[PDB]
Amino acid sequence: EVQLVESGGGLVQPGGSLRLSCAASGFTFSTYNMNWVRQAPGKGLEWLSYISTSSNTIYYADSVKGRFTISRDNAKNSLFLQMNSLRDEDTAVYYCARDRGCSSTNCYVVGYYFYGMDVWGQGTTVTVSSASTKGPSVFPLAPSSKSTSGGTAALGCLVKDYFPEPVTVSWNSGALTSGVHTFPAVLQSSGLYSLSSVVTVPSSSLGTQTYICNVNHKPSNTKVDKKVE
Amino acid sequence: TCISECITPNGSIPNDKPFQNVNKITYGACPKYVKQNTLKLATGMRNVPEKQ
Amino acid sequence: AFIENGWEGMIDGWYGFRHQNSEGTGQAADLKSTQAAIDQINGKLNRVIEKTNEKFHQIEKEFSEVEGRIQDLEKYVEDTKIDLWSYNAELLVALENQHTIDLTDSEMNKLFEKTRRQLRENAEDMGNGCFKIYHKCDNACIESIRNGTYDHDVYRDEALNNRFQ
Amino acid sequence: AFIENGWEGMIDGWYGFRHQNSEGTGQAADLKSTQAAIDQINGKLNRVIEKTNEKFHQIEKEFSEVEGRIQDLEKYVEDTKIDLWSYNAELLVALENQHTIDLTDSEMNKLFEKTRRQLRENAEDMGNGCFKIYHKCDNACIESIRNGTYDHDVYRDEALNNRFQ
Amino acid sequence: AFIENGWEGMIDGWYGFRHQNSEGTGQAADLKSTQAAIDQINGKLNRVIEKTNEKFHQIEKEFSEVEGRIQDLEKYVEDTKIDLWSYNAELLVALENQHTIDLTDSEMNKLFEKTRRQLRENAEDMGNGCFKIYHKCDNACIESIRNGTYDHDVYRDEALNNRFQ
Amino acid sequence: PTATLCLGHHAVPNGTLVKTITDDQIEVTNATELVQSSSTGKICNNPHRILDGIDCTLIDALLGDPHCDVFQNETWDLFVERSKAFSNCYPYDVPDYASLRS
Amino acid sequence: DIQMTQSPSSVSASVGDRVTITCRASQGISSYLAWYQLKPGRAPKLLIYGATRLQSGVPSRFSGSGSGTDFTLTISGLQPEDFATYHCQQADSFPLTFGQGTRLEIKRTVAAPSVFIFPPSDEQLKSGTASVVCLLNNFYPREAKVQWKVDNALQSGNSQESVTEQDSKDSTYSLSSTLTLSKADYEKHKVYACEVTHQGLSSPVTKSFNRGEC
């Protein structure tokens, strides 16, 4: 079937250079138009560039200003998205999409981008940051009795100053899953991510049930377990 | 007791239309039975609706 | 669709004009181009929806007892002429709707030609289906082009002093 | 065919323009008139070549043993519906090719009307499908008429001093 | 029908011109637009009236002895394909007569475009299918626009002094 | 001097989609449906002489079934055979049933 | 640059209700407007192309029309498995400016949020930093005001927060406000508090704790 597979992602410093890829399969790549639409964290979609099958009609956005280069090859059926002069604002997830072409059901004669893009790929995460890989720092939180009539008490763990995102955080190696809320990571002043995870538990099981907040990081192989009491 | 120039088994229809989808078995001055149920014949221009 | 928008307030005809001068505004349906279009529209209807029926003795088309080859012949016979009448319904009515848009475009082109053959040195187009009259045009001047009794040599010396100047 | 010749070097669209000024020459495909034509072309394809098949049980059309009247009846209907589908193939596809030349002529006429509604007092035709611009027109002026954002009142005082003089 | 009336005295072609100057009057058939129209007219004839016959063995269509179901099947078979050929006769010939009026209107529009692409600053329309030439046009000038060899830059300085003045 | 003369058409806010050659669905100002998708539900007896075969079919009136004694020398234009019709006499068999009934 | 102004910012409706999503512009995109269904962690899908026709593969529960500048996305077949953020894309003309997006949420009963707080533990104060956590659970909708005050004085510009996604079973939300402090700033101040302002609360419920009660 029609499926677009992206590649060329990873971790880079502000000021480097990369070359993304858009592997196509299931259709003729030399007859449909391609583009480059990203998705910024906290913002909406943003179109960047557009190319045609004849490789003569190339358009760019206002934020590009010639800093990016988009190419293609009919012999390999892929794109060549060159990324130059990057900054911290360009840290987003990039996607490649195929134009529809016509206003009918199946477009036997491919036109232009005037009728949306019905084909989208999975995408790859491209992180542009000068910070290196750093293990997480687990800080426990001492619970206390707050609700008098209800008799509940909240507790959690603070995962701060880690790189990169994300970190799979659970309780008792996946045994405690009811009431567990996972918070998204936010940017700090140093550029490192930070999130938290709590679990609604009653106050009767504070001094009896052992709550071990397990923190596991994949690319750094850091496993720090701190008992929450 | 009514007046109709076309008879159909699922209820009589008037003969002021060229096609029909009621039943294939007809009698008299009846429209032709087609499988297409929706035939919107335009009697005017296309709908262009104002800006403001 | 180069007409940007029509007129929803004009419900007394398919076509017309919208005048605007010092004596006020308003809409008036053209009695010439509207009646010339219905003769082409209603002429397409009565040769299709009227006097096109066949009164004859048909055969049995639905059967409950399956006999064999005698019913298998008339089943392929009946399903062909149903699909042939359905293919002709997708051939006629889809082309009649296609020609009607071309007919209303041609009736607009004849209305643009009737207005264009009287406003050569007197007016120019604007781009949204309206004409920019370069002279004084009262309500009698609007009805002169509507009824086709407009004169070109009368308003020639007045509009040419403001068209290219 | 009054266009004398097309453009073989323009392979990025069905229509377009060929600019020529002091900043050089080149060809650029129109994104407005080309996409508006494929919607009319591909709309003619998907209602004919797609979802127009019939899935049903047919009968035997070729026989080796000659039986008599039972085979002579089904042979006459089968030879008719093949010839009726062949006559409809000579009625549809020959008219679809006839309308497509009229469609490309109408899309050229709409492109001549979109260019003609912006170049009344600014340019004139030449006779081979080209317009003679009587004022300075850079690459931004070419893209203004291509995208439909050209202004008539801006270049009015410049081209009128060289059109009739 | 905006041509008010044709020419009954011109029996040497379907189209032509009627000149009027100081050297007398007369009618002359255009050799270009008439021959280009018969190629579209006669092309519609030979694909319909010629090589459209079928030579094959048919069945008995009229019976004197009423047998029953075997005759009732072929009676509904024969009456359908006669009515299907009659409906296709009312679909083809009525549209061929409709397209022929549109063909003669398009051949007149191409003749108005061929005359319009040579008489922009040299002449103007009158409203009855005639052009008002604002310069001296002898019999050689009439044959220049008839054969398509008319020059616009030659008679530009003569007709512009009397068009807007 | 100076005026405005526009050339337009009528616009209806409540239109319907039609079937054409260039597009699939396009809304117009006014359109009629050429297919009768509704019926009165009852058979009219004018101008055609409609006969009501309540207790007998066409073959039952031709053979002499006792439930159709009121159809003696009766002419008609269209015979309506009901689905609840049955025979209450000597049973018969009609080879080529569509031959004799037509 | 033409900005695709949408209205409103978020629509809260239950299963079976009608959703009205508008997206205006400044030019004619009556045949050049594309609607998408953007999901968090999933690929976008073209919902309505040209602002008049339905994309193949999408069921007939969605609808929409509109030309000139006024457009209306009418969903009369809203399912609980179709709650996502929709966007409108301008195709006429370049550059392809996207809209802000309308987040479609499930209409739920407004409940009173439970105010929580967390004093800093001994494992964090010895590392050279400090942070005060203010937790809010079981609140609807997400428009909740939370302010910080230190020693009867409000502070700003040094606080962060995280908002969880909508639950599939309870349909609740969680919010954890994190204040940025240091080792020297923790010993300077004594009283810390967290203000909680909610629409369902008839009185502002707040919590306070001393620096010596860790």
Residue numbers in the entry:
A (entry chain G): 1 to 229
B (entry chain A): 276 to 327
C (entry chain B), D (entry chain E), E (entry chain F): 7, 9 to 172
F (entry chain A): 9 to 110
G (entry chain J): 1 to 214
Copy text from the publication:
The envelope glycoprotein HA of IAV is the major target of neutralizing antibodies. The globular head domain mediates the receptor binding process, and the HA stem leads to virus-cell membrane fusion induced by the low pH in endosomes. The representative antibody 28-12 exhibited broad neutralizing activity against both group 1 and group 2 IAV viruses in vitro and protected mice against H3N2 and H1N1 virus challenge in vivo. Our two cryo-EM structures showed that the 28-12 Fab specifically recognizes the conserved HA stem region for both H3 and H1.
